[PDB]
Structures are given as C-alpha cells and as structure tokens.
C-alpha cells in the first residue's frame, strides 16, 4: 500500500540542477498544489536563478518522448505518481 509514488526517473545533467530540481520540485509542490504553478515555480525560479531558460514541465505519461528533445543537450526527468516532470535547458 503506497498512494503517493513521486520518483525521479532519469537525469543527464551536471547534478547541481537535478539537486535544485529535486528541491526546487519539494518546495514547489509544498508551495503550490497545482501543475500550473508548480512548472512555472520551477521554470520561473530555474530561469530566476539559473540563467533564461529552463524548460520545467508536468504532466501525465501523455507524450514525452517525442517532443521534448529540441536539441536539449542536458535534461532530468522527474516522476510523481501519474504525473511527469521534464526540466531542461533548450538553449
């Protein structure tokens, strides 16, 4: 029994954004409820504070693996229950 996954998934970054997303993921989410709110916390604080611009996204096992390349070059992907989180840098 176990209502409440929220798993990292992968991450091919330095680790400094995979720690910050991981935190910035916790405190989004405690901050915010929402999905909205939540990828533009993390992609408002990522861009905020990590130089324009991050591309912090959630959704649902919908279809992230056939548009969320853009030539990334370095991204994480997070995982909660149901729900997919994607921050990277398409820059």
Same mark, same amino acid.
Not at 9 to 29: I, P
Not at 48 to 60: A, E, L, M
Not at 64 to 89: D, N, P, R
């Given at each position: 029994? +176990?209502?409440? #996954?929220?798993?990292?998934? %992968?991450?091919?970054? +330095?680790?400094?954004?995979?720690?910050? @997303?991981?935190?910035?993921? !916790?405190?989004?989410?405690?901050?915010?409820? $929402?999905? #909205?709110?939540? @990828?533009?916390? $993390?992609?408002?604080?990522?861009?905020? #504070?990590? %130089?324009? !611009?991050?591309?912090? $996204?959630?959704?649902?096992?919908? %279809? *992230?693996?056939?548009?969320? /390349?853009?030539? /990334? #070059?370095? *991204?994480?992907?997070?995982?909660?229950?149901?729900? @997919? $989180?994607?921050?990277?840098? +398409?820059?």
């Amino acid at each position: 029994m +176990s209502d409440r #996954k929220a798993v990292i998934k %992968n991450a091919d970054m +330095s680790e400094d954004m995979q720690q910050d @997303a991981v935190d910035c993921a !916790t405190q989004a989410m405690e901050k915010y409820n $929402i999905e #909205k709110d939540i @990828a533009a916390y $993390i992609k408002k604080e990522f861009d905020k #504070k990590y %130089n324009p !611009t991050w591309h912090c $996204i959630v959704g649902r096992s919908g %279809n *992230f693996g056939s548009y969320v /390349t853009h030539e /990334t #070059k370095h *991204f994480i992907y997070f995982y909660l229950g149901q729900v @997919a $989180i994607l921050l990277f840098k +398409s820059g």
